[PDB]
Amino acid sequence: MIMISILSLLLSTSVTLRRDMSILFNRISIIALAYCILHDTMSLSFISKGIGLHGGLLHITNLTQIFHIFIFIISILILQLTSFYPRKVWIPEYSSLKDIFFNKILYYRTKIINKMGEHMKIIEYPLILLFVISGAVFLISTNDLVSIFLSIELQSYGLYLLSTIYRNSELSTTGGLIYFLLGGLSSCFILLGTSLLYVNSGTTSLDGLYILNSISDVNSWYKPYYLNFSLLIFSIGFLFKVSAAPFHFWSPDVYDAIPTIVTTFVAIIAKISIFIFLLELVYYTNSNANSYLSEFSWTYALLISSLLSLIIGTVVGLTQFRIKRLLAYSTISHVGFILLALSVSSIESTQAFIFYLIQYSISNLNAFFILITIGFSLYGYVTNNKEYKSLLDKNNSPIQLISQLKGYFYINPLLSLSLAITIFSFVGVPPLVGFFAKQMVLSAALDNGYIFLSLIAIITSVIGAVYYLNVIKEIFFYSPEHEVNPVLNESDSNFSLRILNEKNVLIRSVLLKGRNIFISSPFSITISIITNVILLFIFMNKEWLSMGTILVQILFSA
Amino acid sequence: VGIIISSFLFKMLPYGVIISNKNDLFFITSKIWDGALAENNHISSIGNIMYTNYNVWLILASFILLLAMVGAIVITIKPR
Amino acid sequence: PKDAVHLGLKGAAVVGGIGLLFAAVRTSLARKNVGPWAIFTRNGKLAATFAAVGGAYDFTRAAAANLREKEDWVNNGIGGLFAGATMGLTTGRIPRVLGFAALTGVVLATAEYAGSGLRGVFKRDVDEYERKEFLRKNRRRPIEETLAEIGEGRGIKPPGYYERRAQRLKEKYGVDINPVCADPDQ
Amino acid sequence: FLPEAMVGRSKIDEKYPDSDYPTLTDKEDPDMNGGYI
Amino acid sequence: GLQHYKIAMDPALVRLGSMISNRYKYFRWTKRTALVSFMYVVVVPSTIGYLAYKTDGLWDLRAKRRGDLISER
Amino acid sequence: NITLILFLIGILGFVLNRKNIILMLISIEIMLLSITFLILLSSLNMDDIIGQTYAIYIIVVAGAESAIGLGILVAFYRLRGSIAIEYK
Amino acid sequence: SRHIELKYPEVFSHGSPFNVPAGFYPNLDHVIEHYRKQHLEEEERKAKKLAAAAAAA
Amino acid sequence: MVNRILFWTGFGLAVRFWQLGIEMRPFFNRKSLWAYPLFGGVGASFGYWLQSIDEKQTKMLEERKQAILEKRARRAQRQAE
Amino acid sequence: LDKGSIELFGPYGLERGLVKLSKNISSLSTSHVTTYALYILVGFILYLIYNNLLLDYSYLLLIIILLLLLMMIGE
């Protein structure tokens, strides 16, 4: 269904050079991703560690289908940023259910809604996003070495093309260029990793590789050394893609350069798909009996990366003045918790890994919506800061500085508290969802003798909490540097709005000012839901946590 | 970098490749009749399986090429 | 009984070999061309520094083991202190020699007592289900276990405490214990 | 390839100057106050 | 917030308070200071703690008559 | 053995490149050549038509990557005006 | 679990149908017996559970 | 203390409340008030759905906990031989 | 003590040093792909060193601290 949607959307896009069709191509992509969810929900009535599909090249697991549906739902939420205009004129006179469904409002809205903005004029943008989803979804379902390479390239190439999609932006072309070049080096390690596996084992299926690893584990001419250190080179190419230290220098630079609406998809989706693929490959290749092979485990790279990502992520973020250079370092410290949970291969660590990855994806999505919404809210605000006049690509990245958020509690108080809750959830403060995620990973690692990494993680969290608190200190401790625009609220200039009925007949005409302009509901409702999930997780915890208990029991059963 | 990678990447390669790196070995080949009934050319042997047994690799490969055809044009096309 | 001097060179070679790597990388990232042999001209003070720490860590951690004849977490503490100390001498500040000795010694001691799972954690090889159940449902221990290892007294006065006290006081002070009869009668 | 403000250390040096942490010598600051007369 | 009474703010007294408030930034590890820090952070607590260790359970007064002893260890 | 030599040329031609980004895109090509060439020789020694099929799919993605790379270079050059990596 | 169950047991049916030497493919009759038993055991087991629900009508 | 349907019904009310706050639009516009039954109704519908899948999750773990005990019971039985 | 060494061997000292350390690691960020390729190659081969050579984990911990102490040192 994802491919049928790609081919159908590509056929309509191919006969149109009309840029006014971009908003509607994006709304159709949201309907298409909702059919993929219905199909994936229908496929969840079986219990199994895996069923080979299409000649053994692909496979389906309950874990596979849960993660595809999550990828499809995250994608629907990100797609909202290109399928609805950022600002909406709302009036109490046009607020009933009868009014919404049977009455029309006419006013000049090109400037108020930013109809001809860059995020509203790229025609192929929802089409290229579907390509990354398709690559992400196959990679979860891959069963073969050749399948792995093709799917990670389909994911990677579309991410390069999304980073360069703003062609008239020098900043985006550079982030796209850096990402493509360094990601091409990343794929050369993945290809070398797969090639050495096939060259030494004669097989291309992971299912066959797992059996060779399992027989080999006992307690004289062919010792299976190649498996661990072919998987090590294989793993290094994926630690780049998730941006784990010391292969993380690229993401702070690229995330800050590309447009913010683009950075939300580019920085979230690839992590979800790669960590799920690595999870099942970590489980099958674990040796249940300690031997010489266990001394050379490729999973040691995952512990080095988690140890480094915890240290690098929290320390280098201390002196980051750029909001998006800071979110990347924040992610680098969070993938350290994900990597540490993944490296301890235990029922408790696998539940902790599943739950941390889902909650951080929804929480990091909340941060990006708030950032994107705080920017669009500055339309009726004016500033005189020499620093905010020297910023580049202000349309693609409206908020680029932490200082630009100074005094935002005095401009939008509840939107600022939404960001405060999301940031406090990144710190790990109870009773927010991020505390429970972090303490589940700490639990599992404590129970498995990884005491030293648990001590490192808690110490880095206090270091990482320093720059989190600096964001909140700017939003609440200082006065705003943004003032209301004097012309858009002057009590002498207003625009006129007509309210029409079901058949083009005037009911009443109203004269409106800049105080009658608000954030469009798709972005306020989305932020409201994710904020409330973070806040009240302690009351809605049972089904979500029990989903991961069952998925992990299946993976460890039989 | 040359020494470390090459030394480390040497044992990652199998005996079949490291062969032919004063008593050397000689490869011996003979003939079969059952396996020679209708010898295929290598391109025919790949065709025997490339569109049935491994058709998934073809569908995925055709979608990488499609994204490349659409993306390379989208980022370089002159506006109209 | 291990050769501290023979081990020390190996530790210097391994750690210092990494020093040549970062020295060669710092050489390649130099904007002004200075020549291939500048690896040991200005970058020498990096590989020399790194091998100095490796030998200082490995020799002292080996030398301390031979002094006490027991391999445990502490040996990596002393080696950590001397590895940290030797990293200070490059800076030249007495606060910095101790600050690094404190940092490196505590980090390296902490990973040996805990047995950091970087190379892999210990294998129980036993039923994890019964290890949890045994610890949880063991609720009463024999009194000898607490008494032998929290002592007797300080409010821990088991039956027969007073008779034991009388004998213990007799051997240390040579006084027969006999409180007065606190009553004209009897 | 990126602009100097976005990845430059000098902009960080403006955001976090080293002068924010005084480093007086004993000649001018013997009492370890702010150089208090 | 709300205005207060008029105070004859002494410039010398307000700069003494600012110096005392800001004093932490100018501390250095000097020869005398490490001795002061070592004495009061390490030596004095160590001495007090050691004597507590060597006198724990040593004495008890509870109902000691004539013929018993304060000492129990 | 030649597969290793070629891979090292492409890896240093990508990392130790101080010329232009087109040469970096060439070095990626050289590395994929060497990896493909190792898979081809192994396929012959194990009688496997799958490794020739695997090599063929590396060639098709290798060309797809070079099209996206050349397309992204054109975008970057249009704005920057130089695709020369520069060292001060 | 330390035992791998093939996600794709149908890999036992792979191999070229052309230019086959006589005596080349190994007999997999014991393999097919195994998988026959797993199928008969699963369906048998299912047939008992659904009959229990009818008994609890 | 907690009902899955009452919580999610009240959850939808707070989403509508928090959404008008973020938009800086007045809560309880008289002519807009239909959205609190709507948001609260969607939460109730969500709570019904969660209530049902919680029954499915209880079964799976009860079968699973029985499976673990039966695996262990039949493993120690062979040890006593 | 309370406006002196406790602050310096504590919050103020950690605050002073950690700002210095973080700025130095930020310096390694140049947005030049060749420098970032070289960083990747250094990290790639170092992971091969640790795994293939069967080094002691103390060495790896020793290197990490030792790299922070260089990065703490200016220039």
UniProtKB/TrEMBL annotation, chain A:
It is found in: Membrane. Signal peptide: none annotated. GO terms for biological process: ATP synthesis coupled electron transport. It comes from Chaetomium thermophilum (strain DSM 1495 / CBS 144.50 / IMI 039719). InterPro entries: NADH-Q_OxRdtase_suN/2, ND/Mrp_TM. This is NADH-ubiquinone oxidoreductase chain 2. It catalyses: a ubiquinone + NADH + 5 H(+)(in) = a ubiquinol + NAD(+) + 4 H(+)(out). Pfam families: Proton_antipo_M.
From TrEMBL, chain E:
This is NADH-ubiquinone oxidoreductase B15 subunit. Keywords: Membrane, Transmembrane, Transmembrane helix. It comes from the Eukaryota. The keyword Transmembrane helix applies. The chain crosses the membrane at residues 33-53. It comes from Chaetomium thermophilum (strain DSM 1495 / CBS 144.50 / IMI 039719) (Thermochaetoides thermophila).
UniProtKB/TrEMBL annotation, chain F:
Keywords: Electron transport, Membrane, Mitochondrion, Mitochondrion inner membrane, NAD, Respiratory chain, Translocase, Transmembrane, Transmembrane helix, Transport, Ubiquinone. Its EC number is 7.1.1.2. GO terms for cellular component: mitochondrial inner membrane; NADH dehydrogenase complex. It is a multi-pass membrane protein. GO terms for biological process: ATP synthesis coupled electron transport. It comes from the Eukaryota. It is found in: Mitochondrion inner membrane; Mitochondrion membrane. InterPro entries: NADH_UbQ_OxRdtase_chain4L/K, NUOK/Mnh_C1-like. The chain crosses the membrane at residues 20-42, 54-79. Core subunit of the mitochondrial membrane respiratory chain NADH dehydrogenase (Complex I) which catalyzes electron transfer from NADH through the respiratory chain, using ubiquinone as an electron acceptor. This is NADH-ubiquinone oxidoreductase chain 4L.
Automatic annotation (TrEMBL), chain G:
This is NADH-ubiquinone oxidoreductase-like protein. It comes from Chaetomium thermophilum (strain DSM 1495 / CBS 144.50 / IMI 039719) (Thermochaetoides thermophila). The lineage of its organism: Eukaryota, Fungi, Dikarya, Ascomycota, Pezizomycotina. The chain holds residues 87 to 143 of 147 of the full protein.
